[PDB]
Design a binder for this molecule. Structure first.
Ligand SMILES: [Zn+2]
Lengths: 98, 75, 50, 230, 85, 139, 233, 50, 49, 50, 13
RNA sequence: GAGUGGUGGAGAGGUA
């Protein structure tokens, strides 16, 4: 399936029950057409090639647009072997580096 | 509903009808551009529609008679 | 069906970061969770932080 | 309000690096508060000079070697990262090390300028083995705080990089170890007062009363946000 | 495009012929130098449609304006490349 | 009007720019394996147009985004002329169908006006750029 | 080294054949960072030979799992060694003992959840001392294949590119020895004749894969007899 | 034998010392075990994994 | 089973056990307190374990 | 060598005897310094009568 | 805050 | 009408 990342897990004790710490790099990759849409909506992007290269240059306006896109938009943290029903849970992601 | 939607569950009665009516309202806000009647506090359309249903300005038959009313005043 | 072959060699330097697996010799594997500062690490009364 | 104020009464130097300092008199209960606060600030936020860019002649990347020397170029960069420099006037200087002949290359062989002081004249860097071998490196010493590494400085550098400017990580903090003790003060009329015995261990480049003064100014200017605004 | 039951049964030879788009008559798959498929081979473009998007083999028709025509020098039908599968 | 060597200079530059921005859409002609190897063995009339190294393209996209925000129709016809390859006869018929000779006239004069606005700011944007020098060695 | 060992470490590092163990005892004549030479004892010398062994060392060569392998000398000049002694340490050897990881101060306590279910919380000074920064040497290859429209060209007059990419390369279309590259930059500028023999329009240069950084320690060029070389070769 | 070695080292014989807390300055209530375990770093690096 | 799956596990459990267990005569036993606010003020000040 | 001064961004006054002084941003490992120093002073040193 | 500032008011710059 | 190939398949080893 498309739109899918993978990483090593770690422990966040500072979170709440509905939050997971997505990395910056994976989130910027996963939400790429959402970033294109917000860039064209905010008048900075006019064409798909300019949006592609503005993401692949990784500007501070792209980091702000990602921080606005992520806001209350859940992601499903699957783990395999997904034996029982609760092996897929959806969390509202918070941005971290790393 | 920004952490737990159980208040919207008690308002509707069922999770699947909650998802369906909130999807109807969020589609009306993203396509039709209708105004969210709760103050938005910089939120997305899905959580805005869940907060609408959670407050109680919209149910399934409320949205149905509202769309039928705008239909008959359009025609 | 080749003409000339050029081979290069890149050499990164991989520092540790949250996610690099670590383990002692006795099967106590782990994954590094936070790189705390020196002041937040616990010390002892002589002054040497763990 | 029956409080008092402390002063630096006796500053003993056990050596050139390891040196304790007293504080007297502190109020009741304040000892661990000031000691832990000065520990956190004195370990995190002190300014010290360190090696940043090393420029050896005839060496392209840091993973090569050179005939005549014994320690490899990564070993030389580590032994240069351990260096302890004290500049006075400028905030960015360039030293020079030139030496030929069989024998080890100490840190005392750097042709120093007037305002730079190399405080470790037995810091070894190289072991020149051939008498026809030479080494001419040009070090660059900035001044900052904290830890700024090579990855973030290659990302953040807007200038170009000629092949030869080898980038060394920056360990800027000259404080390595600090411990405080809350004794019982010898006050002739009070028994409920205490002294704070901070036991620093520096890089040799920082002056302990100056370090304590700077950490105190950092703490006071941080607390001014609580004092003035609400 | 809206089915509601998947019906299965045996296949009459007339049904197999009416599915088909031409008999393959040669075990040669493609050529080895000029990599176009042969005539009546196992990838024969006269049977299994075009290879490029809105083209013929000889390159006479190159445009959507010839929506579906038959190239007289190759026998192929210009469509989109979806009909190849 | 404008001199003709400047005219062919802007023709080549915006042609290269439209060829750059045409290689980014999704609904595009995806080839098979066999057509790919026939093209690599013996090509026909499948040749492409040159693009940029995307920083020159970035700055010229930035200048056309800055000046061409006030006009939607000229931006649309320069896109559909420079990216797809439609003729002025074709876009004139396409805009008249939803007279036609005056439609051709107004699309060519709005193209002339948009080029007259974009040219001198493009010359200044070209001359105020530092060329990044080649890699050097210090000993 | 490990402080708590088993005495099999010298066995593993000697018999694993990766250090430079001496063949005949003597004194060292000249030790370098690249190679160690030794003058043999006259007792342990046969007179038919010349009496000098040479120990070349393999500096910074790629392993089979892309890790680094090098050989720093452990003896200094004017230092007698015997037969069966170690002279140059391998990739993870300290003085002929096996030395795989580093030994570091450990406290056994829960710390605000940050070591929860087999997790490890590491101080800053482990990073600041650079105790755990390994070296990963990665090989990227470029081949000049041969289509039937001409051989592919390794050259720096590539079309459709500018000074945001070509500025690291030389006139020959090949990266210098020592330029620090980042992901997606051109290492070897390869181009292929598109039409028959511009007409070399397709640009098939190498790029660093996204996530790889660092220096270019070596470029090795092979050829077939039939193509004439360039300035870089 | 290990406790004999520790008594030679002028250390607490049980190995447990009394660590402090670098975060809030104060003391951990119970003695904490501190020593030098030989940590590896395995070949499962988070840059190759993500 | 209708028994919750968000149970604390081993470290939260060691902490809550160490909170809610009691010694005999540790430090400042037999005091009388207005409530949790004064009790936590006492513990963070260190006058009662 | 210049430090980040904060702005006191919020006093969420819950009741007349309640507050929550949201405060941002500080240098890495300074929130614990200010918080612990103020907490120990407010616990065991603030003058008053009862 | 002013208690701690007046406590540290001695040895500053 | 405007860049480009592993999946395919085998074998071996590894992680949870
Ligand atoms: Zn044809």
């Amino acid at each position: 399936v498309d739109y899918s990342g993978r990483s090593v897990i770690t422990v966040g004790p500072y979170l709440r029950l509905h939050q997971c710490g997505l990395p910056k790099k994976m989130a910027l990759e996963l939400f790429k057409p959402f970033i294109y849409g917000k860039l064209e909506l905010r008048g900075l992007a006019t064409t798909i090639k300019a949006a592609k290269k503005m993401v692949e240059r990784e500007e501070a306006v792209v980091w702000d647009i990602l921080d606005e896109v992520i806001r209350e938009h859940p992601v499903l943290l699957n783990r395999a072997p997904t034996l029982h029903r609760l092996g897929i849970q959806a969390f509202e992601p918070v941005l971290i580096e790393g | 509903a920004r952490v737990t939607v159980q208040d919207a569950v008690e308002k509707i009665g069922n999770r699947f009808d909650l998802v369906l009516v909130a999807a109807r309202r969020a589609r009306q806000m993203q396509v039709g551009g209708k105004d969210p009647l709760v103050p938005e506090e910089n939120d997305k359309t899905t959580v805005i529609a869940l907060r609408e249903i959670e407050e109680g300005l919209i149910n399934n038959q409320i949205l149905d008679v509202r769309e039928r009313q705008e239909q008959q005043e359009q025609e | 069906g080749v003409l000339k072959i050029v081979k290069v060699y890149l050499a990164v330097k991989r520092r540790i970061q949250p996610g690099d697996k670590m383990a002692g010799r006795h099967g106590n594997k782990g994954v590094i969770s936070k790189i705390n500062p020196i002041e937040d690490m616990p010390y002892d009364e002589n002054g040497t932080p763990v | 309000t029956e409080f008092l104020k402390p002063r630096l009464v006796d500053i003993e130097q056990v050596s050139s690096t390891h040196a304790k300092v007293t504080l007297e008199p502190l109020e009741r209960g304040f000892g661990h508060t000031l000691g832990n606060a000065l520990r956190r600030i004195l370990l995190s936020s002190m300014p010290g000079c360190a090696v940043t860019e090393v420029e050896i002649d005839g060496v392209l990347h840091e993973y090569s070697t050179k005939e005549g020397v014994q320690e490899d170029i990564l070993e030389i960069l580590l032994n240069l990262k351990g260096l302890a420099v004290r500049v006075q006037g400028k905030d960015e200087v360039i030293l020079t090390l030139n030496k030929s002949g069989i024998g080890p290359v100490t840190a005392a062989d750097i042709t120093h300028d007037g305002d730079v002081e190399i405080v470790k004249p037995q810091h070894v860097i190289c072991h020149l083995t051939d008498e026809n071998a030479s080494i001419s490196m040009r070090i660059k010493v900035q001044r900052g705080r904290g830890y700024v590494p090579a990855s973030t400085r290659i990302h953040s550098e807007e200038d170009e990089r000629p092949i030869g400017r080898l980038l060394v990580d920056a360990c800027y903090s000259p404080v390595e170890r600090i411990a405080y003790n809350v004794e019982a003060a010898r006050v002739e009329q009070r028994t409920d007062l205490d002294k704070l015995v901070i036991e620093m261990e520096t890089n040799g480049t920082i002056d302990p009363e100056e370090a304590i003064r700077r950490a105190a100014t950092i703490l006071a200017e941080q607390l001014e946000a609580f004092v003035d605004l609400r | 495009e809206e089915f509601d039951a998947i019906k299965i049964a045996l296949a009459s030879p007339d049904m197999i012929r009416s599915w088909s788009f031409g008999e393959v008559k040669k075990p040669e798959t493609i050529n080895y130098r000029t990599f176009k498929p042969e005539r009546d081979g196992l990838f024969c473009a006269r049977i299994f449609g075009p290879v490029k998007d809105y083209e013929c083999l000889c390159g006479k028709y190159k445009r959507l304006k010839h929506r579906g025509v038959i190239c007289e020098k190759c026998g192929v039908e210009v469509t989109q490349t979806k009909v190849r599968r | 009007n404008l001199t003709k060597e400047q005219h062919e200079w802007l023709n080549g530059w915006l042609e290269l720019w439209g060829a750059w921005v045409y290689s980014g859409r999704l609904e595009k002609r995806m080839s098979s394996v066999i057509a790919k190897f026939m093209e690599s063995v013996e090509p026909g009339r499948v040749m492409t147009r040159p693009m940029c190294n995307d920083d020159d393209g970035m700055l010229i996209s930035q200048v056309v985004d800055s000046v061409m925000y006030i006009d939607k129709k000229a931006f649309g016809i320069l896109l559909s002329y420079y990216a797809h390859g439609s003729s002025k006869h074709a876009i004139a018929s396409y805009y008249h169908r939803v007279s036609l000779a005056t439609c051709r006239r107004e699309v060519d004069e709005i193209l002339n006006a948009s080029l007259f606005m974009i040219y001198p700011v493009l010359d200044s944007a070209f001359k105020n750029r530092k060329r990044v020098e080649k890699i050097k060695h210090v000993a | 080294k490990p402080l708590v060992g088993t005495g099999m470490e010298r066995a593993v590092a000697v018999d694993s054949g990766v250090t430079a163990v001496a063949k005949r005892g003597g004194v060292v004549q000249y030790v370098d960072a690249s190679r160690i030479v030794i003058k043999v004892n006259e007792d342990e010398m046969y007179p038919g030979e010349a009496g000098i062994d040479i120990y070349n060392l393999t500096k910074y060569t790629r392993s089979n799992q892309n890790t680094c392998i090098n050989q720093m000398p452990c003896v200094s000049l004017g230092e007698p060694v015997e037969r069966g002694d170690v002279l140059a340490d391998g990739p993870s050897t300290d003085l002929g003992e096996l030395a795989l990881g580093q030994n570091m101060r450990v406290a056994f306590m829960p710390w605000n959840g940050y070591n929860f279910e087999d997790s490890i919380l590491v101080s800053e000074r482990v990073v600041q001392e650079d105790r755990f920064t390994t070296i990963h040497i990665q090989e990227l290859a470029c081949v000049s294949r041969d289509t039937k429209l001409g051989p592919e060209e390794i050259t720096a007059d590539i079309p459709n590119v500018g000074e945001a990419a070509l500025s690291k390369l030389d006139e020959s279309g090949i990266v210098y020895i020592g330029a620090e590259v980042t992901g997606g930059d051109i290492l070897v500028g390869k181009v292929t004749p598109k039409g028959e023999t511009a007409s070399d329009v397709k640009d098939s240069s190498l790029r660093v894969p996204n996530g790889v950084s660092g220096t270019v320690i070596d470029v090795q060029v092979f050829t077939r007899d039939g193509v004439e070389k360039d300035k870089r070769a | 034998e290990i406790k004999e070695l520790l008594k030679l080292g002028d250390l607490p014989t049980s190995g447990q010392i009394r660590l402090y807390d670098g975060r809030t300055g104060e003391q951990f209530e119970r003695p904490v075990t501190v020593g030098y375990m030989y940590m590896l770093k395995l070949n499962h690096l988070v840059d190759d994994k993500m | 089973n209708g028994e919750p799956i968000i149970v604390p596990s081993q470290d939260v459990v060691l902490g809550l056990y160490y909170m809610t267990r009691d010694c005999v005569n540790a430090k400042g036993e037999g005091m009388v307190l207005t409530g949790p606010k004064e009790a936590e003020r006492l513990y963070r000040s260190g006058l009662a374990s």
